[PDB]
Amino acid sequence: VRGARAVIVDLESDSETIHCILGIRKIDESVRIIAEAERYENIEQLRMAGADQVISPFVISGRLMSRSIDDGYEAMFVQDVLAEESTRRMVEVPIPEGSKLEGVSVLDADIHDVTGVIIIGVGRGDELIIDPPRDYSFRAGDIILGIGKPEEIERLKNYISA
Amino acid sequence: LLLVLAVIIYGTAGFHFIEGESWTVSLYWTFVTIATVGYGDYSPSTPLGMYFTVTLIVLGIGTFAVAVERLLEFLINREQMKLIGLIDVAKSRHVVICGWSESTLECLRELRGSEVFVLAEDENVRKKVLRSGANFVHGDPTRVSDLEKANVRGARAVIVDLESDSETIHCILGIRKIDESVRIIAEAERYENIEQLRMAGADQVISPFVISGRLMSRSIDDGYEAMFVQDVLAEESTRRMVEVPIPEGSKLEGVSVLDADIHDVTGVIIIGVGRGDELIIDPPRDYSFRAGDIILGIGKPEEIERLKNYISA
Amino acid sequence: ILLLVLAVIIYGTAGFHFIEGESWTVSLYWTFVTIATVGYGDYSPSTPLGMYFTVTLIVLGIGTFAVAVERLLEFLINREQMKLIGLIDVAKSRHVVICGWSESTLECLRELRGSEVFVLAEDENVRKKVLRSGANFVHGDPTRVSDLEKANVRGARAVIVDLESDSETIHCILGIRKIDESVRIIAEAERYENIEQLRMAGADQVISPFVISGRLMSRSIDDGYEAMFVQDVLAEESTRRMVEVPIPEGSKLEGVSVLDADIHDVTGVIIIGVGRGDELIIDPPRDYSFRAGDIILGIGKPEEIERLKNYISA
Amino acid sequence: RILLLVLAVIIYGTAGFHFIEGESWTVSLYWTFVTIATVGYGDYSPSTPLGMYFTVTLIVLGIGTFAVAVERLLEFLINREQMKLIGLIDVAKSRHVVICGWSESTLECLRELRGSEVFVLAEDENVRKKVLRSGANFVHGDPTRVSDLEKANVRGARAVIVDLESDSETIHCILGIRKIDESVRIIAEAERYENIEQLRMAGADQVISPFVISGRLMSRSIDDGYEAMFVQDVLAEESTRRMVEVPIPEGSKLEGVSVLDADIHDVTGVIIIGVGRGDELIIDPPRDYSFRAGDIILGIGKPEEIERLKNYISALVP
Amino acid sequence: LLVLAVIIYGTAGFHFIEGESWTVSLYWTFVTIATVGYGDYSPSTPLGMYFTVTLIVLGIGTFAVAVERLLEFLINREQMKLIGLIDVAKSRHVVICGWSESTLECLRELRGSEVFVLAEDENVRKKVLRSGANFVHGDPTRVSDLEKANVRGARAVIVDLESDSETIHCILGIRKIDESVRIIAEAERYENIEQLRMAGADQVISPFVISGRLMSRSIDDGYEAMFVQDVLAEESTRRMVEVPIPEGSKLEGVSVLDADIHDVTGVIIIGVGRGDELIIDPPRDYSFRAGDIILGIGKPEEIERLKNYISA
Ligand SMILES: [Ca+2]
Ligand SMILES: [Ca+2]
Ligand SMILES: [Ca+2]
Ligand SMILES: [Ca+2]
Ligand SMILES: [Ca+2]
Ligand SMILES: [Ca+2]
Ligand SMILES: [Ca+2]
Ligand SMILES: [Ca+2]
Ligand SMILES: [Ca+2]
Ligand SMILES: [Ca+2]
Ligand SMILES: [Ca+2]
Ligand SMILES: [Ca+2]
Ligand SMILES: [Ca+2]
Ligand SMILES: [Ca+2]
Ligand SMILES: [Ca+2]
């Protein structure tokens, strides 16, 4: 575990998951820990134990269920963007240092028009802004969350450099 | 059954001759002496009745105790028949949940405010279900006679998560033997049986472990992928993900989405557009909006309102 | 449910109001006595328009009341608990919460005779023993936070945690630290291999009895006095009690070295250790300067306990 | 019995090579050992077809018997371990310790008995792996069956330690021990307080009730945990203070000397928490306790000041 | 069939591919396949060095096929063939269906007889061998498995299974094979001793009924239970023996009182056996017929005396 890229933890019960996480942090207190949460009631308890990211697939499912009564496009969206069988892949693209976009407003940049990548969100460290407002200034090192074909991602990666 | 009448008629005789009452006065006495009401309109007027008073206390008590249990059971099935009568009017809009899992629980928490029935084979869940806000129906969701007990026919939709995928499939078949048109949403424990669920009549299928495992993998490098899905689904964020329908005879029918500049015009992100039973993610620029198309987008509730107007005639 | 109770009540007060000719006051006491079989006597059927209405109202009213009386008591077992549950408005370190029912938490409870303690357990049959040991019982999963709140862990004296596994024990502690993050948490550890994990979760004090027992065993091979001591001080059968004594501000001992203080000579109380915050020094050196607030750990007779308690004040 | 049959194929080959090709008693044995062990050096091939039959059948049937010897040899590799074990049980003047049951306690006990001869006896086979990495020998057997207590050489052991799954089984084991060595020291863990006496009735010398200890420490740790901090810290070797039992030899400078007259804490710095008279211990002895010979002094102190008590206590020179 | 494959490939590749006789070419195959590889026929041409590797593989498969299948078959066949030619086997064997504490304690008294245990639980195998009996893994209710214990032509079959139903089910299966072989069966409930006999149980022993009655009789004084348990152990010097009255007896027609057996031989006559029924404490005027069976307690020395006192 020490000198691992990350550790993914899904054990039979949430207690055992936690108990595992604490043990990890008693070895490599910085290695990335991703953990599955069976109950919503203890997402926070998992994070307290040192879980860096927490995915609770039953909470996702139930909410997708409810949204799939009227029309199922919500659940259709989530599942298809995540399969590489869909040509649209969901990629995180970094803004290089000394960017052509540093300081450029997202509206001034017209990324959707320029590269065809849909900007679903923009990442500032460990927090994410979905559908950024028009007046969001691109800083360097921001992370772009987007959907697009592999060809139009390569275009954004060039459009973003110095 | 017939034994309850025996003590009643037996009392009407010991008051008809042994206390000097009519058949109508003796019958009204026996029904009150059995319920220990002792209102008082007929007390033993002769020691042949005061003897009959002591003796009928045993015979009258037995008829009262047996009748309440059978009538309450007949009032509990009638309450089951009267509770069944209330779901039929609410039925053009009710939702039936087959199985009680963590998935179906968190779905129910987002259906706060609808007529919902949970059907589960384990009884102790009833307390949890009621403190969660739904009606409970004890039954095996594979037996059709219990699906009928939840008025699955003519429901808004039925949601199905059972212990295994085999039971889930079996249940869907039971539904389609009642309402072959009701919307069926079902979770699949294994990816290996998504198609089998759809073959059996599942209209929409959600596989949360495939969602999970994939978010896990994408959370190693950077966790924004997993962060996106989970946040769009909580109603607490100002960005809501809404399906917007394109009315017939729209300002957009035949208008290209590139000519529409919807993100530019209304600020709503267009992540996909739906034509019937399929959804196209990041639609191409030259997609003609037909009538009835569904717009899948994220946006502020204000800029959603702009999309709803910008799309009309 | 409550619609059946209104039926016998409304139909009887009306069937005596019109079908027997009574006021609302005579008909309701008629229905309330005819349905409840009280038969106080203020309204019996004086006409067969009532004698028919009596039997049908009393039968339907006796049957509807019988279903309703239990429903009221079922609401009176939870709502009378809800008025008593509403009564815990103290904002004080009064009660003690014990999470889990093991043999340890039983032996602990037997030494808390005279205190108000709450046991929180997921297994229901435990209720009989808990009451016969002197505590109140709360049915709930001590890992669920909404059930920790059912024991008012928030603003408790301390919480004691022994669950079936160490994983469950940890999970509970983390939940506690999500309500009252300062309450003292005492937790039992089944494996030595994860004591640190228990403290990481927020347990202030951790007791691992298999390590105690294992170590006492090892020491009882040759001669058993090591084990004999630990078990004997903890039973009140010895006249010697083991007490923690604090050093107040303005002591006759404040700043005085323990050798110059010569506590063993002065008071006869054995000084096995002195406590500084969250750490303890056993058999302190002769040249230990007592600071204020130090805790003195000692064994002695109840008479000589008072002497050290006097010797330390102004 | 079946393994006893394996020796036959070698001799039949030693017979099938002695006459069917004309070899001596010395030549017949050297031929079979290469044909059966598949070494096949090659010094004897069929010079008449009558030998190729007796060779091939005896080489094949004997080769199967040669391979079978490994299983007996693996048993023979356990008997050579018995010749090395005989050298270790006579290393010093202390004999071995038997641990009946594998609990978390006996695991923690075994970990502090590093350096004594220890044998664990448990009916669970998978326990064997943990026992070896914990440093003791394992014996697969039911510690209630006496024929399996005997398999752990309980007679003439230093002591036997008993923690079984239930208190009932523990008792049965103790009684089993006492049907062999009615004097060997028996230490037993008690899972319920309700039957300590029953454990001693069966012949248990010392009984440890870790739930009674623990339950009581909790009750006392609510306010401040120095009590519990004390017990656990005296028992870990990480603290510099050791808790030692010191005996008062016959004819001591202290025989007849009061514990107050001895000024032991002042003289030696060792804290005297108790003194032992046989199978009972007096905690915080009264000021006028007369030290007799053979009494045991229970005290805490640094290794240097332990040395001080050991001399201040010793007997006068002849 | 695998042994023939390497044999055919090897005995020809040394007869033709290197020039050896029919006896020399096959002798090459038998050592190279068993990896003995003595060496008297090695590849003298690469045409043999090529087939050597293939024959080393093909011969290894036949050697493994010959070693695993034949040696297991050579250990069980050696038990049936060496027993037939070296020394004789006294009488037919015994079958024990089920492995309980009863059938275990039964085996302790059949030390030195050919016994076969049939039980469906495999791990029982080791204990049975160290008890001195042979083991057969099978369900004693399935008839095809009773056939596996040679029930037919057994001396007797002893049946104690987990439940009384399974015991019965077993008994009926036996009688569907050897409808005369002696069947002894343990009864867990008194309520169905008769049902066991209906199924064909010749003798029925119900050890819990014995125990309970011994318990009750052991309250006042325990000599009853002391008697039963000690007469049955050979640790007691008194053994309980069945002695037959030979044809043309010295006692035939002699009253038991006229015979004074207790006085004459010291054997206590606890009962006398007339076929499948037993008379306990016979009356004084019981005439000894020939072939009657005497049930008695005595030391081994005084039994030999009765056996002489009883002859012609
Ligand atoms: Ca999982
Ligand atoms: Ca929808
Ligand atoms: Ca695009
Ligand atoms: Ca599920
Ligand atoms: Ca990523
Ligand atoms: Ca926007
Ligand atoms: Ca415990
Ligand atoms: Ca010792
Ligand atoms: Ca003292
Ligand atoms: Ca234990
Ligand atoms: Ca304290
Ligand atoms: Ca010192
Ligand atoms: Ca049995
Ligand atoms: Ca008796
Ligand atoms: Ca005799």
Author numbering:
A (entry chain D): 175 to 336
B (entry chain A): 24 to 336
C (entry chain B): 23 to 336
D (entry chain C): 22 to 339
E (entry chain D): 25 to 336
Paper text:
To further determine whether the missing linker segment may impact structural refinement and AG diameter, we acquired a crystallographic data set of the full-length MthK to 3.1 Å resolution. We then completed the structure by extending the linker segment to connect the M2 helix with the gating ring, and refined against our data to an Rwork/Rfree of 0.228/0.275. Here, we compare crystal structures of full-length and truncated (pore-only) MthK channels, to find that the AG of these structures are in distinct conformations, with the pore-only AG forming a narrower cavity than the gating ring-tethered AG of the full-length channel. Consequently, the channel’s conductance is regulated at the SF, through an allosteric coupling with the AG. This idea is supported by crystallographic evidence demonstrating that the AG assumes a more open conformation in the presence of the gating ring, as compared to pore-only structures. In the case of the CHARMM force field, MthK shows the maximum current for AG opening slightly larger (by ~0.1 nm) than one seen in our structure. Maximal outward K+ currents are observed for AG openings almost identical to those seen in the most open crystal structure (up to ~0.1 nm more at the level of A88), and in a very good agreement with experimental currents from single-channel recordings. Available crystal structures of MthK show distinct openings of these helices, making MthK a good model system to study potassium channel gating and the AG–SF coupling.
MthK is a tetrameric ligand-gated K+ channel, related to BK channels, and consists of two main parts: the TM (pore) domain, containing the signature amino acid sequence TVGYG of the SF, and the gating ring—a large cytosolic domain with Ca2+ binding sites. Binding of Ca2+ ions to the gating ring induces a conformational change that expands the ring diameter, which in turn pulls open the pore-lining helices. MthK consists of a pore domain whose pore-lining (M2) helices are tethered to a cytosolic Ca2+-binding module, known as the gating ring.
